[PDB]
Amino acid sequence: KSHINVVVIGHVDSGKSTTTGHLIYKCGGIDKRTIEKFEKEAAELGKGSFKYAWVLDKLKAERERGITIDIALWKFETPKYQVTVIDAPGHRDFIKNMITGTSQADCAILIIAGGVGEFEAGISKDGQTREHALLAFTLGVRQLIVAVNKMDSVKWDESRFQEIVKETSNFIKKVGYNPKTVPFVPISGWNGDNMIEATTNAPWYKGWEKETKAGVVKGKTLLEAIDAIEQPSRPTDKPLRLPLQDVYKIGGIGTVPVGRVETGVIKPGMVVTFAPAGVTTEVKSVEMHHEQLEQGVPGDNVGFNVKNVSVKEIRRGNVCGDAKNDPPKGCASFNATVIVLNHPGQISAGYSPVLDCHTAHIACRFDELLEKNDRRSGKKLEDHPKFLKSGDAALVKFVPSKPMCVEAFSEYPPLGRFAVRDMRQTVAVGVIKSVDK
């Protein structure tokens, strides 16, 4: 099965975590042993019958106490895909992680509460949910699924669902998504309505639909909507790009850089170059985990041995690529479309905050505010704005304070998106449009 990443977003009262838990649980994504002990307990409480939601509550408690073992990532398999899901945290430091993180989503799932009060509270202009949707859209997550949760709280009323769909369509349209390409699925995460099996509580519901470039796709459940995600393409054809995370000196082996293959492929015997270091050498061997790989592909976090290089000649932030196939280089400057997030203040030329791009952490000057643009279309609205404020989209010329290797987002996505840090938060997100190498 092919693999895809999905990010679930929504207001704290949307029930997105309960919904996410149900999917993983009932799609065989949870550890067998874990489920057994929690189901056994769930049964003991009464005559035997138990709700899946109770089992999830017990797991949540174990996770909260910091007992649950292994990485904080949910995974499950649909008929067509192996899915890794990120149930977006509300933590303010997650913003930078979403931008520079390794697991970029192929589709976002916006969970919305159907209740009158809870629905309005979730589509607020200044809400964290809109910020996550805006970030997803900005970073190129073009596939979206909307699940209207807690339908039981509104007695599965068709009018209410229709009004929610209309208001939510306006909400996502303003962010930038085309509502016609988005399935709207009424569900009850808690009860399992329209999750894996079609609901029996809404005779009027005929299913969801979405327009694609080839036609119209329809289905009934949220699981079907996920399976309907259009197959994403991987960067295995592009030249190698491997940002360094660490570098080690192993006696008898030599220098061993470690990082994630973002684009292209790395193989032993290959000749590579490290920018902006300017070092070129042969890849002796490649290892991942307990195995000696024959090749590292996009997504693989690998360590590799290179010769005639001191662990001091290369370091974190440098980028490794093929020496002859469009080798990476440091830049004199780079232009990027910057979307200013909600933060108190105004940004003027001269501003020099720290930027996080792939594994680079370098202060870069907003050398010139080239234009202010209409965010969704990118159309230039003004030449040389005097300052930028929350909500603005603008083309900015950046000059790094230290040697730095970046790429245009359209060419090498992982090296073309960045987060701007200041005032204890991410104040802006950038997408690199051009680079002066």
Binding site: V12, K16, S17, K60, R63, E64, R65, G66, I67, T68, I69, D70, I71, A72, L73, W74, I86, D87, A88, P89, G90, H91, R92, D93, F94, N97, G101, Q245, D246, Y248, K249, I250, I253, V256, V258, E287, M288, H289, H290, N301, V302, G303, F304, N305, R316, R424
Partner: protein, 90 residues
């Protein structure tokens, strides 16, 4: 109730000789209001080197992950760097 997030951090040593038991002990000794350390394991990353993968549960309003990472990295004798491997809503 206070909003929380689960964070999985990767803590990397200097080489294949770094004392890993001391490395994780020093991490777990760090105290922050709203911070609870969770399970951990050592994962091979190649050539004999092993990284520390450790989970923690933090109260969104009280714990700065930047500050936490910086504090862990003060242990220069054992830690080369830290990275956020995963973040999930609780």
């Amino acid at each position: 109730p206070a909003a929380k997030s689960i964070v999985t951090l990767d803590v990397k040593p200097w080489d294949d000789e770094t004392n890993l038991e001391e490395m994780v002990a020093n991490v777990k000794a760090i105290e922050m209001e709203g911070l609870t350390w969770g399970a951990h394991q050592f994962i091979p990353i190649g050539f004999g080197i092993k990284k520390l993968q450790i989970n923690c549960v933090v109260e969104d309003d009280k714990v700065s992950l930047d500050d936490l990472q910086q504090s862990i990295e003060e242990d220069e004798d054992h830690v080369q760097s830290t990275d956020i491997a995963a973040m999930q809503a609780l």
